[PDB]
Design a protein around this ligand. Structure first.
Ligand SMILES: [Zn+2]
Lengths: 211, 128, 24, 101, 82, 97, 125
RNA sequence: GCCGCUAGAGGUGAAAUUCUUGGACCGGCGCAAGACGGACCAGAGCGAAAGCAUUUGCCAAGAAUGUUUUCAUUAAUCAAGAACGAAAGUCGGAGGUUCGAAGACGAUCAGAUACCGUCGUAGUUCCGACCAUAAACGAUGCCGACCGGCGAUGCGGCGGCGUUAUUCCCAUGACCCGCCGGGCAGCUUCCGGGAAACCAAAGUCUUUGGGUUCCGGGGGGAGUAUGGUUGCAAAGCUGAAACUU
């Protein structure tokens, strides 16, 4: 039985979510050079936001990487964000152009992000026509506003407020209000956040990052 | 299947166009009617003709049949509307103002029995 | 005969003919 | 014999549309001669959704749908009965067929 | 149609047509004078002008070149000449 | 729309966490205007206190009148102890400012 | 409510029912459609995935894994992107045989028009 | 490459060749390589045709519209001549992930040296130098004129109730109802044509002439033979008879 030498560790979420205990992980025990707490330092979980809070919003999934283990508690830190596949394919219909941009914005804590966006053009309620397309200058300057907001509203913040912005998507509502003089948009999401480089791990920042 | 063929429902109708003053709603009278008014070979055709003129007289006296002639209208001119006040005698006729410009440029509209109503805002009449 | 392969077979024939004619 | 006026395409007024590959036989058709079809169903079937629902830990979780965009070549539609052969005088009907009663 | 008079066209159907397709062609531009509200030069502009027409008191711009009619600067006053 | 009417609080308390207050209010209007939430639950009073709270500091007077008309349509049942309480709490927070 | 993650690779030739922990690394059990039938014609059956689902349910019940998330997956890439016939019998049988079911998501990998496919230009005839 | 589970993976109508206790397939975090730009993507756009799709630049170029700007017949078509011309192909160099002629095996069949599987050279990919053919298709030369309608669609312009920005009656854009020009196409019509299919041109043609360029003369022989020239080569262009029916 190779399942006799496996202890069950607990995994703790960061402080931005309501619910902290997200589930139970496994490691073979220390019998040699293979230490347990290095044996899990690379676990990445795809955890939905209707699991980290008890809201209904299920389409926005989070990546949380275990950086240090204290007691039997795995302490996680934020690794990225995705939309699910059925939400992002539910929104590509015909008769609307889709405006997608990406920026690499460096936060004030040393962390580098890459933020992907999406946006579609909304058809009007008194409209007759079948097709709702934008011209190319409208797509170019809506994309310019999109990259400008997504570097300005992430640029001078710490990481905890960035993940606090990413939970309700204030950035998507801000883009949709600011871009309405060019073409009225339809649901605008930050689709994917990547974490490209992380700075040196020291325990005080994570131990204050849990509360 | 008991569907009546061409002869028992064309011959029954040409029996019904003339001789309507003899026919009725009971089958046994019309069965006895059918030998004075025709020359039919043997009785199973005659009972089938009598059954269709009984079914057609069951149908015909509450409205018009397509196949029957206006001998029906000879029955409706023999047996058989306006209101008291006409539906074109209304006392206020709403007029949207392009019609009022037309009537003013037809040398009417000095006389007023009409009342012009407010023009529509919005031009969304098409379908998407 | 499909006319591309008639073309290809006269192509092979002419390639062999010009092979046999420039030996001398 | 000209059979179709548009030649069974959407290429009017350009020289070349880039090809796509068929999902059923991998036969390289152009983008607009291929018969596009967009198949949306639920992820779990109509039968098994009655006893998926007793196992969900989440109260009132509406299950997601499966978004498959299918291209098909012209041979494998008449093999696969997606699109069937019609009369000479109802070929001018390009209204899509009714899915409602 | 088919009794239609080509020698007496109505002005609804003479402002309808393209400027080359009338009986006598006649241009769809007109000459304005722009009054600037803080100076006293009446300044003569084209309707469809292609340069920035500079006034000589307070050196402001009266009109902006666009693909159609020149959009006059907002708050001046104009009327058509003749 | 929402899937459950308690979720209006969980959304609106997240928008105030960063500090945006205009999406916080207009979510809380858009849960009340929905057609599946006019049948009385216990959570409809404390989101209506919060929506009347949020109308105060943005000083939107037109928007608070509509929702207090809409909630008055909703509690046509006998708990006007709620409708007394949501009204004077709006009339407490206006005097304090 | 100890959660695990079930991975359903539903091929046209095979059926992989793979139960792992929440990150995915520590595998708890893996049963394929090749373990429960003797024939290559019926590896992708509903029946083979039914039996494979019952065995992986009996394996994960004894370890603490009470509830499951679903990652439902087709062959993907340049091949067909419908999950085949052995997805539904495994996913019905896990909810019938004593487990609990979490969120179901389609994880079939989709390209930005990646490289050329295995058939010719002129098809698979 | 590092994990951490396990006896099959692959593939097919069915299978076998192939991979696997030196650890495959599946799962996880990673690195790199080269190709490619899905869904949005339409009878929509641009281009002389071949063709052209991630972002932001930079470099020149162009149709359309608007014009009370200028020149003053400068124009249309094209012997000779030249520019570009998919894919395959050839040569020199760099690159090589996948596909994949030839080829080696498997299995289907009487037999398949074909379709169907496993692997693969040349090639596909890029930078230079060649070759100039395609159902290069609207199987429809180009410029101009005239001749019914209709409702949309792409661009530019003009005029009209309204509705929406929000954050200043708010700016300018997004919609709504029309008009003009140019463009890709559409449905209808006893205009008219046609052998008919059908076409608003393939109409205005025995009531036969607006201008101009290449080309066809029953079917094969044959786009062959020879001659010429172009090309490293494969070949390209010009290119007939005798005879037969
Ligand atoms: Zn196919």
């Amino acid at each position: 039985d190779p399942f006799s030498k496996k202890d069950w560790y607990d995994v703790k979420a960061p402080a931005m979510f309501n619910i902290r205990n997200i589930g139970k992980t496994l490691v073979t025990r220390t019998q040699g050079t293979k230490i347990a707490s290095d044996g899990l330092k690379g676990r990445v979980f795809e955890v939905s936001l209707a699991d980290l809070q008890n809201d209904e919003v299920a389409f926005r999934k989070f990546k949380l990487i275990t950086e240090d283990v204290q007691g039997k508690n795995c302490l996680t830190n934020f690794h990225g964000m995705d939309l699910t596949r059925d939400k992002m394919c539910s929104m590509v219909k015909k008769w609307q152009t889709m405006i997608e941009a990406h920026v690499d914005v460096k936060t004030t804590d040393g962390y580098l992000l890459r933020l992907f966006c999406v946006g579609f053009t909304k058809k009007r309620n008194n409209q007759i026509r079948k097709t709702s397309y934008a011209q190319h200058q409208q797509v170019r300057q809506i994309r310019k506003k999109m990259m400008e907001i997504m570097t300005r509203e992430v640029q001078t913040n710490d990481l905890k407020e960035v993940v606090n912005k990413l939970i309700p998507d204030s950035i998507g509502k801000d883009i949709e209000k600011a871009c309405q003089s060019i073409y009225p948009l339809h649901d605008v999401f930050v689709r994917k956040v990547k974490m490209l480089k992380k700075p040196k791990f020291e325990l005080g920042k994570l131990m204050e990052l849990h509360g | 299947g008991r569907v009546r063929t061409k002869t028992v429902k064309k011959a029954a109708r040409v029996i019904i166009e003339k001789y309507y003053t003899r026919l009725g709603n009971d089958f046994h009278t019309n069965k006895r009617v059918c030998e004075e008014i025709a020359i039919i070979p043997s009785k199973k055709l005659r009972n089938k003709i009598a059954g269709y003129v009984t079914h057609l007289m069951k149908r015909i006296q509450r409205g018009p049949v397509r196949g029957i002639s206006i001998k029906l209208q000879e029955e409706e001119r023999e047996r058989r509307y306006v209101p008291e006040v006409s539906a074109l005698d209304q006392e206020i006729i709403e007029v949207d103002p392009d019609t009022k410009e037309m009537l003013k440029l037809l040398d009417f509209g000095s006389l007023s029995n009409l009342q012009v109503t407010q023009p529509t805002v919005g031009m969304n009449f098409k379908t998407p | 005969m499909r006319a591309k392969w008639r073309k290809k077979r006269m192509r092979r024939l002419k390639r062999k003919r010009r092979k046999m004619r420039q030996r001398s | 014999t000209k059979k179709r006026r548009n030649n069974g395409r959407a290429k009017k007024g350009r020289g070349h549309v880039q090809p796509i590959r068929c999902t059923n036989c991998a036969r390289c058709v152009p983008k607009d001669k291929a018969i596009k079809k967009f198949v949306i169903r639920n992820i779990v079937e109509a039968a098994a959704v009655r006893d998926i629902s007793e196992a969900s830990v989440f109260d009132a979780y509406v299950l997601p749908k499966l978004y498959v965009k299918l291209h098909y070549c012209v041979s494998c539609a008449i093999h696969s009965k997606v699109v069937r052969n019609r009369s000479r005088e109802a070929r001018k009907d390009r209204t899509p067929p009714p899915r409602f009663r | 149609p088919l009794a239609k008079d080509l020698l007496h066209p109505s002005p609804e159907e003479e402002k309808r047509k393209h400027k080359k397709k009338r009986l006598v062609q006649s241009p769809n531009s007109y000459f304005m004078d722009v009054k600037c509200p803080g100076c006293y030069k009446i300044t003569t502009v084209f309707s469809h002008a292609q340069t920035v027409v500079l006034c000589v008191g307070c050196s402001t711009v009266l009109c902006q070149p666009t693909g159609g009619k020149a959009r006059l600067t907002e708050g001046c006053s104009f009327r058509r000449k003749q | 729309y929402f899937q459950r009417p308690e979720n209006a609080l969980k959304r609106a308390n997240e928008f105030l966490e960063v500090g945006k207050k205009q999406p916080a209010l207009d979510v809380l209007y858009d849960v009340m205007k929905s057609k599946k939430h006019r049948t009385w639950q216990k959570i409809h009073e404390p989101i209506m206190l919060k929506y009347l709270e949020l109308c105060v500091d943005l000083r939107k007077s037109h928007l608070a009148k509509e929702g207090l008309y809409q909630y008055k349509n909703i509690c046509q049942q006998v708990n006007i102890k709620s409708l007394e309480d949501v009204v004077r709490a709006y009339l407490k927070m206006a005097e304090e400012k | 409510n100890v959660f695990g993650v079930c991975h359903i690779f539903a091929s046209f030739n095979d059926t992989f029912v793979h139960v792992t922990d929440l990150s995915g690394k520590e595998t708890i059990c893996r049963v394929t459609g090749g373990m429960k039938v003797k024939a290559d014609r019926d590896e992708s059956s509903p029946y083979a995935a039914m039996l494979a689902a019952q065995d992986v349910a009996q394996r994960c019940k004894e370890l603490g894994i009470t509830a499951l998330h679903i990652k439902l997956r087709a062959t993907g890439g340049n091949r067909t992107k419908t999950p085949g016939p052995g997805a539904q019998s495994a996913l019905r049988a896990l909810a019938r045989s004593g487990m609990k079911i979490g969120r179901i998501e389609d994880v079939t990998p989709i390209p930005s028009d990646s490289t050329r496919r295995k058939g010719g230009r002129r098809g698979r005839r």
